[PDB]
Every structure is written in structure tokens, then in C-alpha cells.
Amino acid sequence: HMTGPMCLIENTNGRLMANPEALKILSAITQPMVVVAIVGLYRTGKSYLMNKLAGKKKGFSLGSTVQSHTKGIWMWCVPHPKKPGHILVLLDTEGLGDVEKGDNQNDSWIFALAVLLSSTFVYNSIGTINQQAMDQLYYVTELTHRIRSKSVSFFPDFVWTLRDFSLDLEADGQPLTPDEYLTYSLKLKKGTSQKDETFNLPRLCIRKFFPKKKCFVFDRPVHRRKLAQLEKLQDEELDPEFVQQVADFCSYIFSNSKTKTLSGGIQVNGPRLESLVLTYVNAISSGD
Amino acid sequence: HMTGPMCLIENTNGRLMANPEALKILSAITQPMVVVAIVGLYRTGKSYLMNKLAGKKKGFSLGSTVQSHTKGIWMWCVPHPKKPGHILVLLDTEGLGDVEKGDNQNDSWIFALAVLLSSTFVYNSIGTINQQAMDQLYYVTELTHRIRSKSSFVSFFPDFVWTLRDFSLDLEADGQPLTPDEYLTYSLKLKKGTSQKDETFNLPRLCIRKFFPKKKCFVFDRPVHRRKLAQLEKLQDEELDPEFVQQVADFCSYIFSNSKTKTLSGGIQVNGPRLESLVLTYVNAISSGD
Ligand SMILES: Nc1nc2c(ncn2[C@@H]2O[C@H](COP(=O)(O)OP(=O)(O)O)[C@@H](O)[C@H]2O)c(=O)[nH]1
Numbered sequence: 001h002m003t004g005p006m007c008l009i010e011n012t013n014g015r016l017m018a019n020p021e022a023l024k025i026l027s028a029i030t031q032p033m034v035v036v037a038i039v040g041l042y043r044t045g046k047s048y049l050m051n052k053l054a055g056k057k058k059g060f061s062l063g064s065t066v067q068s069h070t071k072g073i074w075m076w077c078v079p080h081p082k083k084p085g086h087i088l089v090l091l092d093t094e095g096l097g098d099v100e101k102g103d104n105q106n107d108s109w110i111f112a113l114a115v116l117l118s119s120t121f122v123y124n125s126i127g128t129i130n131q132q133a134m135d136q137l138y139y140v141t142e143l144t145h146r147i148r149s150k151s152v153s154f155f156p157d158f159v160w161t162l163r164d165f166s167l168d169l170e171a172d173g174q175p176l177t178p179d180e181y182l183t184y185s186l187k188l189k190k191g192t193s194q195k196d197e198t199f200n201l202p203r204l205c206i207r208k209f210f211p212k213k214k215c216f217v218f219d220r221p222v223h224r225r226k227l228a229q230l231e232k233l234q235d236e237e238l239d240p241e242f243v244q245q246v247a248d249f250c251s252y253i254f255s256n257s258k259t260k261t262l263s264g265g266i267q268v269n270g271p272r273l274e275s276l277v278l279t280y281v282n283a284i285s286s287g288d
Numbered sequence: 289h290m291t292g293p294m295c296l297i298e299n300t301n302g303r304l305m306a307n308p309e310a311l312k313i314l315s316a317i318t319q320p321m322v323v324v325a326i327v328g329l330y331r332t333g334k335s336y337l338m339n340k341l342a343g344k345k346k347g348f349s350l351g352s353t354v355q356s357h358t359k360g361i362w363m364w365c366v367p368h369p370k371k372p373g374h375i376l377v378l379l380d381t382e383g384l385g386d387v388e389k390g391d392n393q394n395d396s397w398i399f400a401l402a403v404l405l406s407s408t409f410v411y412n413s414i415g416t417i418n419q420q421a422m423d424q425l426y427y428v429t430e431l432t433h434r435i436r437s438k439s440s441f442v443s444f445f446p447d448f449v450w451t452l453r454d455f456s457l458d459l460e461a462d463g464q465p466l467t468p469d470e471y472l473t474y475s476l477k478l479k480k481g482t483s484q485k486d487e488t489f490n491l492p493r494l495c496i497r498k499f500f501p502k503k504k505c506f507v508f509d510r511p512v513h514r515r516k517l518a519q520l521e522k523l524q525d526e527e528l529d530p531e532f533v534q535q536v537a538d539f540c541s542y543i544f545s546n547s548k549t550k551t552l553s554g555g556i557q558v559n560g561p562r563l564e565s566l567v568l569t570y571v572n573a574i575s576s577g578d
């Protein structure tokens with residue numbers, strides 16, 4: 001179908017704008033869509049990983065340096081490898097926490113669209129699950145509600161991805177599967193005090209918002225850094241357990257991600273996505 | 289004399305408290321003190337790097353899992369290797385962002401003490417410099433000021449080192465090479481001037497650039513190529529990536545060579561007891577309710 005990705009939402013001087021040439025494309029796509037989005041801190045291997053879902057080396061473009069690379073949000077519409085008659089829609093996001101940009105508001109808008117447009121949301125981090133991440137995920141989650149405001153589940157399913165993973169998956173003595181880890185980290189605290197409650201308040205809203213959760217670890221894809229010629233490498237050349245792990249991740253998405261859905265049940269196709277995108281983007285550029 | 293570290297500030301159920309048996313010790317030490325602290329997200333190889341300043345293996349203890357390890361603040365006193373008649377004091381901190389704890393105001397207190405007790409403050413992070421980091425650094429910085437109050441061009445604010453761990457990426461920008469320092473000042477570079485959201489930027493980059501006089505940055509390549517990472521207290525330098533050895537050596541050399549003597553305001557040099565009594569002052573100052 002589509003040979004490479006194109007920018008869906010442009011990001012210039014803190015204005016987010018739909019790119020009309022993508023809407024023109026969405027608007028022609030009649031099949032239902034599974035939508036996968038990914039976000040995380042910047043320089044964190046997101047675009048590389050998205051590309052593995054499209055089963056191509058080279059697509060969403062990479063960038064090698066300390067400078068951020070992906071700006072705005074890029075979509076890529078491809079045939080669904082495992083659900084005949086569906087399109088897979090990949091969303092690649094500008095990474096959070098650019099110091100070049102120094103703009104948390106803007107971060108939050110992008111984060112929010114991702115969650116809003118997606119039927120599987122993919123939060124990417126390096127090494128550990130981390131409270132500053134928890135936090136932000138909560139904040140954006142609440143934000144999402146407030147955006148739906150202007151204008152049997154349809155909230156997206158969730159995946160945490162852990163990169164360059166090093167540490168023993170172990171805790172309080174006993175082994176952990178990546179999923180036991182992720183629920184360890186949303187594990188509510190006994191009962192009440194009021195700081196027993198401070199806690200919980202994020203963990204609750206997160207356990208509620210995302211029906212399905214899943215988690216995957218990933219070893220460094222290469223032992224030195226020949227880490228920068230990565231658009232170019234086969235799979236011999238990579239650490240085999242990274243290839244194992246990727247494969248596992250792709251199979252989960254292909255086999256579990258659901259068809260994107262509006263409220264009241266209707267399945268989202270091209271034009272229904274086009275219309276969301278406008279709706280949500282128009283909502284952001286007006287008055288809270 | 290001091291053979292291994294010792295908890296200086298206990299952290300139990302969200303109340304921090306000085307450890308008497310460690311003041312008893314400080315109270316006996318009468319040489320001047322260079323103080324180096326380190327903080328950063330948890331599980332980030334802080335305690336390891338810290339041992340390197342003491343030139344030992346084994347010392348501050350490590351932990352190899354996803355759970356956090358170092359709790360409170362550990363101190364460790366030792367000769368200074370370059371500055372005769374001084375003591376080097378090392379301060380290893382509880383890492384930030386523990387999901388088990390889920391408690392930022394506790395984080396912040398601990399951040400804040402490190403900054404307060406130190407003459408060289410070392411901020412440790414994985415991979416990149418990163419706005420949520422700079423943000424937090426700013427927040428604490430302006431928290432520092434507030435704690436100092438609750439206690440009444442030639443200055444006594446700590447010097448600053450950013451440490452970047454498991455560093456992968458090209459040090460390159462806008463087309464032109466970068467040294468680790470050029471990176472750090474790249475990140476604190478002020479925006480051209482005028483307008484509003486121009487000055488919402490800037491506002492943290494200002495306070496940092498004022499607060500910390502000297503600034504330095506160091507990169508650090510993953511110690512080992514597999515993950516025999518997890519025994520590490522017990523590997524000799526042959527067995528490590530020899531560019532990480534290089535880099536540790538270079539960072540040690542800077543600390544030893546450049547970290548100043550810790551100083552009260554009005555100029556007095558800090559020794560054992562004057563630390564004992566800073567620790568107490570700052571710790572009591574946190575146990576009221578601002
Ligand atoms: N250390 C590390 N680097 C990676 C990984 N995956 C990709 N990279 C490299 O990190 C750089 C930026 O990749 P990218 O996907 O653009 O990061 P993004 O900004 O999150 O999109 C590229 O040189 C990638 O080859 C990884 O899993 N670990």
C-alpha cells in the first residue's frame with residue numbers, strides 16, 4: 001500500500017496543524033483501522049521500533065545524534081499482517097523532553113493526541129519504569145478527558161516498552177515476568193492514610209483508563225555502538241535476543257491490538273479518523 | 289579509619305533523620321572537607337560511580353535488580369588523594385523516581401540536602417540531557433533557597449557536574465561537533481530575548497546558570513558489552529570496556545583536581561563538626577511544615 005510514512009500533524013512554533021495531503025489520503029481509506037501509537041522521551045529508539053511493526057528496515061526516519069529528529073506525528077498506513085480487510089496505522093511521535101524546545105505544554109498536546117487517536121498506545125522508556133513517567137501518564141490521561149469534552153471499552157490498550165534493559169527482573173526475593181513488573185508498579189497501597197491516597201490516585205486512574213496492559217523488555221540491539229547504522233543492518237548482525245524480543249512484541253500487537261472505535265461502538269475508517277484528527281487538533285487551538 | 293560507608297541520613301516512613309553514630313564520627317574529624325554528592329534517577333549506576341572516587345571496589349553497596357537499593361544518604365570519609373590535609377566526603381543518595389515509594393516531596397527533600405551539603409554536586413542521568421531533569425534541578429534549586437531562609441563575586445554555592453551514562457549517540461549538533469561541555473552549555477543556551485514563552489524558557493536556565501558557578505559534563509560508555517553488568521563490585525579494569533576506564537579516570541581526575549573546600553557563608557571552611565551541625569540544621573528545618 002503506502003511505501004513510506006508521511007507527517008500527519010505538523011509542529012511549527014508550537015502550532016499543531018493537520019497536514020492536508022495526509023487527510024486527503026486518510027479520506028480515501030474505507031477499511032477499518034487498527035491504530036498504534038508510540039511515545040516516550042526523546043532519543044529513545046522509538047522510530048526504529050515502529051519500523052519493526054511495518055516489517056521494513058527504513059521508513060520513519062532515525063537520526064543519530066543528541067538532537068531530536070522526529071517532529072510532530074507521522075502516520076504510516078499499511079495492510080494488517082493478521083486481520084484480513086483491516087489497515088494498520090502506525091503513529092510515530094516527537095519524543096518528550098527536548099531541551100532544544102523547552103516546552104512541556106507542547107509535549108503534553110502531542111502525548112494527548114497519541115492517546116486520543118490510538119487503539120494501542122505504546123509508552124517507550126529506557127531501563128526502568130519510573131515514577132516521573134507514571135506521573136506524566138496520569139496527567140495526560142486526565143487531560144484526555146478534558147479534551148473529549150470540547151465536542152464496553154473504547155479507551156486504548158496499553159503497552160510499556162523497556163529499552164536497553166539491564167537489571168535482574170527480580171523483587172522481594174521472587175522472579176518477575178515483564179508483566180508482573182508492570183503490575184508491581186501499579187500495585188495499590190494497603191488502605192487509607194491521606195498519603196496512602198496521594199499514591200494510588202495516579203495508579204487508580206491508570207488502571208481504569210487502559211483496559212488491557214502489557215509490557216516488553218528489550219536488550220541493546222548492538223554490543224558496541226555500531227548503533228547509528230541501524231536503518232542498514234540485517235538481523236544476524238543484531239544481538240539475537242533483541243530479535244527474539246522484537247519478534248515477540250510484533251506478534252502481540254498483530255495478534256491483540258483491536259479495531260479503533262468511536263463512542264457508541266462505530267468502527268473507525270479513514271474518513272472517521274480524518275475527522276477526529278481535525279476535531280482534536282481544532283480543539284487544541286482555541287480555548288483550553 | 290573509615291573503612292566503609294555509613295548511613296548519614298536515615299529515611300523511614302517519609303521522615304528523614306540524622307544518624308547519631310555518623311555525627312559522632314563527623315564530630316571527631318577536624319580537617320577541612322571537600323564534599324561530593326550525587327543524585328539522579330534510581331537504578332542508574334550512581335553508587336558504582338561513587339566507589340570510583342574512593343578508588344576502591346566495594347564500598348557503597350550496589351544491588352542488581354529493578355528494585356532500588358541505596359536508601360537515605362550515605363557518607364564516606366577519606367583522604368583526599370590530591371589535597372594534603374583535607375578529607376574527601378562522598379555522599380551517595382537514594383535514587384529519584386522509585387515506583388515502590390511513589391513520593392516526590394520525599395525525593396525533593398533528598399535532592400535538596402545533597403545540593404545543600406555539597407561543594408560539588410553531581411547529577412547522574414542515562415543517555416541524554418533532558419528537560420524533566422533540568423526542570424527538577426530548577427525546582428530544587430529554588431527550594432534550596434527556601435530552606436536556607438528557614439535558618440535565620442565570591443560565593444559558596446556548589447559546583448556542578450552532569451554525568452551521562454550508557455552514552456550511545458553522536459555528540460553532534462546543527463552540523464558542528466560537540467564536546468561534552470559544549471553539549472551542556474548547548475542545553476542551557478538562552479533564547480534570543482524578547483516575547484513571553486521566550487521567557488518561560490530561559491527562566492530555569494537562568495537560575496541554574498546563576499546558582500552553580502563552575503559547570504562540567506562527562507560521558508560514559510556502558511561498562512561491559514554483555515550484561516555481566518551485574519557482578520561489578522568485583523571486576524578489575526582489564527575486564528571492562530577500556531574507554532569507560534578512560535572516562536572514569538578522566539572524571540576522577542577533575543573532581544580531585546578541581547572540587548573546592550566546602551564553605552559556610554562569610555567564608556569559613558567546613559570541617560567535621562561544622563558539617564555535623566549543617567546536617568542537623570537542615571534536617572530539623574525540613575521536619576516542621578513549609
Ligand atoms: N541505545 C539504543 N539505541 C537505539 C535503540 N534503538 C534505536 N537506537 C538508535 O537511537 C538513535 C535514535 O533513534 P530514534 O528511533 O530516532 O529515537 P526517537 O527519537 O525516540 O525516535 C538511532 O541512532 C537509533 O539507531 C535502542 O534500543 N537502544
Ligand SMILES: Nc1nc2c(ncn2[C@@H]2O[C@H](COP(=O)(O)OP(=O)(O)O)[C@@H](O)[C@H]2O)c(=O)[nH]1
Pocket residue numbers: 166329330331332333334335336337349350351352353356357358383453454508509510511517518519520521
Ligand atoms: N547499564 C549500566 N549499568 C550500570 C552502570 N554502572 C553500574 N551499573 C549497574 O547498575 C546496577 C545498580 O547500580 P547502582 O550504583 O546501585 O545504581 P543506583 O541505584 O543509582 O545506585 C548495578 O548492577 C550496577 O553494576 C552503567 O554505567 N550502566
Ligand SMILES: [Mg+2]
Pocket residue numbers: 046047048061062069070092093095
Ligand atoms: Mg523518532
Ligand SMILES: [Mg+2]
Pocket residue numbers: 334335357358380381382383
Ligand atoms: Mg545507589
